[PDB]
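Loading example: each entry is read as six labelled lines plus one structure line.
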Amino acid sequence: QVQLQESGGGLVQPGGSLRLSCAASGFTFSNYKMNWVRQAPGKGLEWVSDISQSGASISYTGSVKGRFTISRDNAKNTLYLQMNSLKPEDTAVYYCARCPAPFTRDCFDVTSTTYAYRGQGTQVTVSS
Amino acid sequence: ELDQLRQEAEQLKNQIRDARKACADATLSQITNNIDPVGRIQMRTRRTLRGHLAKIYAMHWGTDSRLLVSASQDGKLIIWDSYTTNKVHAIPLRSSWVMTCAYAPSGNYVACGGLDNICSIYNLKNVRVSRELAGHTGYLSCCRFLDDNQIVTSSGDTTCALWDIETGQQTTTFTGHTGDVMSLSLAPDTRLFVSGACDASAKLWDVREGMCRQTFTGHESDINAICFFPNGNAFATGSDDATCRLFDLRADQELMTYSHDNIICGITSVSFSKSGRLLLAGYDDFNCNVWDALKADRAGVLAGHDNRVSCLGVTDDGMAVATGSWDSFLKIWN
Amino acid sequence: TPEKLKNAYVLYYLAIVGHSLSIFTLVISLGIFVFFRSLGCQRVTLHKNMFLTYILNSMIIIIHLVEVVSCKILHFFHQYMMACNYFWMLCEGIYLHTLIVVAVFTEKQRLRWYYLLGWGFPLVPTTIHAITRAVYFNDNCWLSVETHLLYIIHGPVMAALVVNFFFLLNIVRVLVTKMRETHMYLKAVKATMILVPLLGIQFVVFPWRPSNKMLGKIYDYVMHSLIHFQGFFVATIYCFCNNEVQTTVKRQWAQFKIQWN
Amino acid sequence: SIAQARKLVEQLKMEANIDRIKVSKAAADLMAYCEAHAKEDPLLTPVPASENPFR
Amino acid sequence: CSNLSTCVLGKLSQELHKL
Amino acid sequence: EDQRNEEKAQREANKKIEKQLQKDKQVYRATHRLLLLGIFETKFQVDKVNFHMFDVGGQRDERRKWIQCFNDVTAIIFVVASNRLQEALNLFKSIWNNRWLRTISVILFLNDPRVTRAKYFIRDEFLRISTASRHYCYPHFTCENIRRVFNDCRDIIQRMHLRQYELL
């Protein structure tokens, strides 16, 4: 029983901002390792960011490093992603993925071919 | 068009959830706790079968309850004789990567499936390949025999399949999951087989129709191994969140949870006793905890192995438990 | 002379304490290899024969110690055990050099050859010494070591050790290159020092007892201490500081607490 | 993904129509099976070394 | 053996035996 | 009166099998199993040693179950393609920190001023994950390629034997 719901999205100006709020229900959120994953229209799934189990070790993709910053909060049982000065080239569908094992550090959740533990998708859209 | 359908599914899903909680009205721990526990179980190793070279990945007993077949990663399928620890047959495999072995209930056929995504069938009346089933597109995780003619296999491209041996084609295909279907067990009436997959979902399939009858989602990570309760109304599942859960077929929900905070180690194999009171679970921290399945207490610990236990089987007469681990030893416990 | 008698007595005390302690640890270390069948490897089985030789060498020396034609015969056994022990160190050095450098993959193909060099070969120089000493010299108990006829038995032993020293030079040369391609000095000095007792390279680096009395006495103390505890230092680094046996011992003890009571 | 969604909804209604026995009854049935066959279980109740084929 | 390191026991045993 | 016959039958049934497997254990341990990444198994000989390599091109990309079978192998050949690079870094970061593949080495194949810096950049990024955590990465480049897998697994077996004596 793992269901991941997401907020945020919508048409934005170039150089605006957006907050994507992944809501997690069903599992014990303190033991797992969260991940955000794009899917640009016409591209495959790409990777964005992650947090470790405590809220300490953060990585990013090179294209979003310095612009996006993410954070979870285990008591609220949520995950966030704050984008800043968005490009007109990075409109995508954002998912909230979870690595499939408790208390590990390895993840295999960039796949499109039927990954189970990921969210619905939030269409961030940038017009001009 | 998609959003409106999703709301209809969500409303339908809501009808499931409220009905399940309403139907429950008690938990299994409450009624059971007044009965006397079984205490401590002392199981002593009686045989240690040493013929393999690489890690023993899967073992299957026979309905003769004397011969067992084990398949290691060196490409050898060995039919042991558990009473007098002698080897009856050694069969070379075309693929050395073999993740399962199955022994037919009549004792005439031995099937092993590997990462070559081909189930192979070996005749036992030298011993040679008889029929090879090549229809899956992923890999082959577990396989079981219904009778000598038809074999059910759980592949790793999200589909269980029912095979006919004399023809070579899949008679029915089961495509409900969303993850690699790791393990199947068969009901004692041999009409319903549960399948555990990587969705944290166990599904109940009726082998004649070909559709998902029931779905049991109460786990948090990939379901490794699954085994029926010996009457056919319940089953236990082992997962990677170090939790064994007992789900009932008739009440359609989870009865019990077998877990401790000292247990941060994922289950690799589950099996029941003859009556069903004892639940045996192999873990990957190299021991096999024994659970009083009615009361969720630890009856005992089987700690004889040296590496990760992969398969665990209890005989049909209920006399022995044979575990197979990654140190190439099958130890038979009584 | 009182000082010499006192000096000999302390060394005699050191020999009894040094060897008895060494044999006690060695039997436990050798016992671990035979008892635990999980540790079966090509080096380990070769190590098992070396360990019994240390057990065999220590007991014969202590039995020689208490007594100090039957006297001669026990000394002949002592000559063979002492010689074979040094040759076995060459055999392990031969195996380690071949395993690391020459033929990198598993080298259980020539195991018969090692036994002939290890056990069968020491018989020929010792039998030559026993036959030659009786006819040429006819020494009592063979208890004279100052004779010039001991070269025949000890000439191969010294030859085996010096080429063994060459093997250590290759191993360190290989090791430093591996570390560099990956605090390296600390590991390198530690690696050479642990290698010395098993290969038996203390003898070659300190070959002769010097003529000066002050230098000789300190030399006497360091040589006696290392040799008497050489079997002890082989048993600790290769059965207790060795990591794979350390894991095996830990799991076995855990079972010993739960199934006992 | 609209065509795929239809498959999930039809699967859901098929599994939603079942009637569910209560947990109180189902726990009583599982308890009853264990009570009846506990005598004939060689792991719960141990067998002597004459009856045990592995001995 | 001529007081080599190879036969430490030989010179140890001999001196004590003489004295 | 047939118990004696059964013992006589089995013991000379078991003895022919046990002497068969000891003539197969020699061939099993003389086989250096390999894995490729990025169903077909091809064994081959270079300088009289056997490399049994299993390509996994027929499997799906949900790798969290079938990669645990491959823990036994000597060296995992890694082939990258050049956002096809960063998603290859995250697979290498996942097999590096796995609790069953912690002791398995990795060989990289990544298949004139501008290109040279680009080749250097890929080498630096991969070398930054090896320093994050018993197993060492081996990078290579474009432009014989099977001799580099022989010459780099020989370094793995030398380093596998130095650990046994606690040297390196």
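Residues 1-55 of chain D form a domain with the G Protein Gi Gamma 2 fold (CATH 4.10.260.10).
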